Symmetry: D3
Subunit: 237 residues, 6 copies
């Protein structure tokens, strides 16, 4: 008798704060390297999740898979069944904005999308997928204390990684979207539904237009930077 169809953890096995990334093997890397006394609490569908502490405060980390439907399943369950209060997505993104650089960590204030899931929640109208202000502020303040450069602004969550859509990148750049990814627009409205909190921070792994990609060391530095920001933010939340 599993608590959810997608998660073998028992109620209480997840901390009130959860970091989530798309790759479950990355969740394990975070738990093994940054958490104290981490225990694996889920492996259903290989979607590894862990719970331990960071500087004495309980903290969990878990994979969410790729795309809005996948993160919607895991986040709904975490808020509803596991009584999680705060989820921070930590991920990678592409960028179309020339002012955004690979060494920039992107702190997401809101996310647009080409999915229908939010129109369906608000009678077909425009529903902004909006990060919680305390979470954003904790991330901004942590990056400043750590002397890590950031960009703060809008993400765009797409259902199609292999985009064929002409004019999209130009419009995203015109309105200064800083990150293109695939999940955050699904996370924020679920947090709203449960009266809980969510945010998102992403590292830039490539310039979508120029097709220039970040080097392995740039990815290492930005990943460490992002994860240090997120972990410190958890102490304020």
């Amino acid at each position: 008798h599993m608590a959810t169809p997608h998660n073998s953890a028992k109620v209480g096995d997840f901390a009130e704060t959860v970091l989530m990334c798309g790759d479950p093997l990355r969740a394990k890397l975070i738990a093994d390297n940054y958490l104290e006394n981490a225990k694996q609490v889920n492996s259903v569908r290989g979607m590894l999740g862990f719970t331990g502490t960071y500087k004495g405060k309980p903290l969990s980390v878990m994979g969410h898979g790729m795309g809005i439907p996948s993160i919607s399943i895991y986040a709904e369950e975490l808020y509803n069944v596991y009584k999680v209060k705060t989820i921070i997505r930590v991920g990678t993104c592409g960028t179309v904005d020339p002012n955004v650089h690979v060494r920039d960590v992107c702190i997401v204030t809101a996310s647009g999308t080409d999915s229908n899931v939010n129109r369906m929640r608000l009678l077909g109208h425009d529903f902004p997928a909006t990060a919680n202000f305390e979470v954003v502020s904790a991330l901004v303040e942590s990056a400043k204390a750590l002397n890590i450069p950031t960009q703060v602004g809008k993400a765009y969550s797409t259902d199609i990684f292999y985009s064929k859509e002409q004019g999209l990148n130009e419009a995203l750049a015109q309105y200064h979207f800083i990150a293109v990814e695939m999940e955050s627009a699904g996370l924020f409205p679920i947090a709203d539904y449960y009266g809980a909190r969510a945010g998102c921070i992403c590292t830039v792994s490539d310039h979508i237009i120029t097709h220039e990609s970040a080097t392995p060391e740039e990815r290492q530095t930005s990943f460490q930077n992002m994860i240090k920001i997120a972990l410190e933010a958890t102490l304020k939340l």
Copy 2:
């Protein structure tokens, strides 16, 4: 000599920071009561605008009329022709959230809408009308310094004041929309287009569901609180 079809002001007559409200007569009240050395710089269409200083820093205040098309005209012109860098909308709103109370100040992080103007900017997709983070932060910090409680969260900008739409308020409440008004979803994407900043702060003048309305006395107090917050925030911007 009309610099724009809707504004007789000369280039340079507006400060880089502008407070805007719907009622041009309220803009005049703000200029007369809170600005030093305010001079009227526009009266086309009766949409009064003024420029003076607040605690020594140049500041303008101007009416924007009712609805997304009206504020879009004035804000597009201010950013493009008058080289304004920051617009803060100051207004009243209704609330559907039982946790928001009349006489509460609402600071807007993002705004939904039933307008089509943002779909038309982003190839028909979901484009969240999102406030600039430094503007939100300045408003939140000023309200804290003044010991004024705030709600920080989503607004909903409607085209239709006299709504006939069943189920809408219930959906807005379920996802913890804090403010219902008519303009901010039109302002924020224009600020994006010009690489500039915008935000919005509103006082709650009625609970849409319960139909409880703020007394004239409550409205006066909440307007005074809100305007002091916005004015103090301009010093940080």
Copy 3:
């Protein structure tokens, strides 16, 4: 205790026929220059309205502001609270039709739009914003009696004055839209809702494509013609 949130007029203070234009100062010019014994009946938000007589018939004139949400507020109130029976919008427009010229007055039979307000009235379907036939006929017949040439046909009401939409003008021209403005599509469905009458007459102030503008002299001549047409039509309604 104001009769509406946007209008200090008492019931009865408005005549059954009202001319409306976007600019309240132009409403004042019409009242002062063409109405006999005009009285100001509203100044809330600077949205001036007046009531007098024209050739013995009571007649009012009032501004409606810019855009569909603004005219919707004022027209809903006039039909509902003030029991107005006929509103004729008088305005200016742009043209894309090479057959329409600046010396032409445009009498609007129906208006398209990029707004969502009419889809929301009819379960998402196409709802044509349609002028009342008796009002259209009165305007056409008055222009003939005054020997003023007119174009009679479709308008297009846009939410965005500063349009960036490619291909729009070409389609409008292909289907012989005679006028581009910003309000009439919101007015006609509200008249329908209250079982009342509405129409629209506009002067051509510029060719959108060439960016050709009417001279100030041409504007004054066409305004005098349009107002002469509208005032005479009120005698037939």
Copy 4:
């Protein structure tokens, strides 16, 4: 080698004015009873068309079938290949409006629809399918001369005769749509495209809501009245 895929008539075989009804056997009845020197000029797909004179004026009559796609084929061809200048649809309709009574003649000023064909012509926006004003006026004046009462107003053209859509009739009634049928919203924009004229006149054969239906005698009398109005109107066009 047929002039079109759907019409064996030669160019010139159609008069510049055409009456069209849905039933080709009704077109034959009109030709046999009201036209002089009539000859059949089409029988492709049983869609009978005829050309003769009415009181000295050349006139054709032809069936158009059921639904927007069907009338769109025939009307496009008549305007483009056969150089027709005016089409008047003559038909029956259902009504939801309590002020409209069975055996009332309905003269259509514009038509709504649940079809996509007009969004596709105007970049997804609202395109009002609008009758030509001279055609409308000619119909109104003809009925006036024959002392036949008329309703003048909006129709609604649906793709689905067998509606299952809850709330539609109530919305149509709220906004005083006078006629529900299946074709006119497809006709008027095609006329626009070719710089030509179109109109529609319908008799009420039933009350959709109450299911009160017109008797056979009411049907014959209302058809006789309608067709005389349409024929007399052609003399002014």
Copy 5:
């Protein structure tokens, strides 16, 4: 009193299997040349329908007119009032697929559309208009036994014969749509609603892209082949 508004047939007059084509004169040709003892059961609006036998099994054939609204009327009535169990549409189509050739028989597994009728059945979502598998298989096996090559795949049902839509033919070709016609996407969901069966078989009369058209003789050969396939399939259904 007619059993339906569009059909004078009495209950029982239609066999449980009906072939339908757009042209009622083609339905008469099929009845005269391939059915034994055919009886005309409808001629309302010239939409001829017939009932006889094919190799001892009862079979009907009837016209459906042009477009989704027209077939929807006739098919709903046949399934609902006349208790028909299986309808097979027999027709012609255009092709965009370079692998499909004039005189190729296309058996339709599903059909896309630019109509709104199926979104209106499934809360605005994507509802695939899908042929019944036993009907598809019966057609496939009959063509094999007759040694007639077939293409099996998707059709696209358009509301607009005279297309002006740029990019449509390329997208249809990109996704291997094999047939462009105007009715099947309206037929299949009505069959679903009544728990009944439907299919479609079409012959390619022209390449829409290359504009190659089938010769008059090739059309007769391909019609004979298609009709032979359909009649044989009824023996298995």
Copy 6:
């Protein structure tokens, strides 16, 4: 240098026929229990994939994760980079159809969806996500050979596992959708784009309306029946 961002396999590591299920641990179970000489060819993101032979025929099996965006990534890569020709999804589903029962095997002919990805492929129109007929037929014939009853018909692929949508189940049931799942509508159009083949077979693990759920014992039996049907079908393709 990985052949794709999501797959470490080299080109040639995948067989031309691939079975895909959502759970990567189920793919491993399939490979270990039914494939001879299975080799792991991918483990990126824990999304295990394997290649071996089934009764001498090369066959791969791999997880696709949850939701249309996830399967779209993996399927696009398999067809485009790895030159796969046939993908069969094997899964579980819920049903709303009163004729479908838990432990029923469902073979999917076409899939509806609430996702936007297929509208974006076909100019906003209705694009039916349609299984390849040869694949459907092979699955149907295999189930017949094994004496396993099957239901053949429409699926519905949703983005939202935790549905809150009123009326959806009733409409799905009215039009006899037999299976509700989350991926197949994304798979079929990608196969089309690449000129390749796709299908789907699912076992019913619960009735959404009656809330009957299959026992763990019934689930294993239905999984075993389904997988044997799919494996045998690959020998015919």
